[PDB]
Amino acid sequence: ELRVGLEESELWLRFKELTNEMIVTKNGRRMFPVLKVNVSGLDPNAMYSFLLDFVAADNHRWKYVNGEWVPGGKPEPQAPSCVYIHPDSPNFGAHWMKAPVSFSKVKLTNKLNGGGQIMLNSLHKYEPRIHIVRVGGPQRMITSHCFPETQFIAVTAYQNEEITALKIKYN
Ligand SMILES: CNC(=O)c1cccc2cc[nH]c12
């Protein structure tokens, strides 16, 4: 089997416990913490592209009320984010397996934007997800992995100061 783990899941779990928030901006704000993925069971000599995207974990708009997050009362079906291609893509099994795969450069925006940046729906909750796409071979293949530990709400500003505190402590 191809095996796909989360690096620094303990760091991530400290945020999940509080309800994680990622800042989103006109031009795009990078993520903290950064999604880092351990990957074994690739073909060292095969070709893979690493895709990242962001599934609306539910169909609700969220709001900060009496110091806690709660869902609105009007679900819209959510489209998944556009895909961000890891820049080491495409690359050999052995590249992706030799060190953790960092998506340190992904930028999250809330605006109708040019390129690079991934536009998210403000105040919706997102599950990060990666697609390992085997390329070059005669048969294209996809393996997808979601990361519950890395769930967050897209915010223009931090609401829970406890999150802000953690973001500065571990940055
Ligand atoms: C119903 N609308 C949407 O699903 C939507 C809106 C704005 C940004 C994103 C990113 C992914 N989906 C989005």
Is ligand 1 within 6 A of the CB of residue 20? no
Phi-psi region of 169 (alpha: psi -120 to 50; beta: other; left: phi over 0): alpha
Is ligand 1 within 6 A of the CB of residue 154? no
Is ligand 1 within 6 A of the CB of residue 81? yes
CA distance 30 to 117: 9
**Angle value at C-alpha 75, between 71 and 78, nearest 5 degrees:** 105
Is ligand 1 within 6 A of the CB of residue 113? no
Question: Rounded to the nearest whole angstrom, what is the distance from the C-alpha of residue 79 to the centroid of ligand 1?
Answer: 5
CA distance 31 to 104: 7
Extract long-range pairs of 144-148: CB within 8 Å, 24+ residues apart.
145/4, 145/37, 146/55, 147/6, 147/12, 147/35, 148/16
Q: Is 132 helix (H, G, I), strand (E, B) or coil?
A: strand
Instruction: Provide the experimental method for this PDB entry.
Output: X-ray
CA distance 62 to 56: 11
- Measured in whole angstroms, the distance separating CA 168 from the mean position of its chain's CA atoms is 19
Question: What is the resolution in angstroms?
Answer: 2.2
Query: How is residue 45 written in tokens?
Result: 């000599």
Closest among 34, 41, 162 to 96, alpha carbons compared: 41
- Beta sheet of 107-109, edge-to-edge order: 29-30, 107-109, 118-119
Q: Which residue has 């900060």 as its token pair? A: 64
Domains and CATH numbers, the chain: 1-171 (2.60.40.820)
Closest among 122, 103, 105, 102 to 25, alpha carbons compared: 122
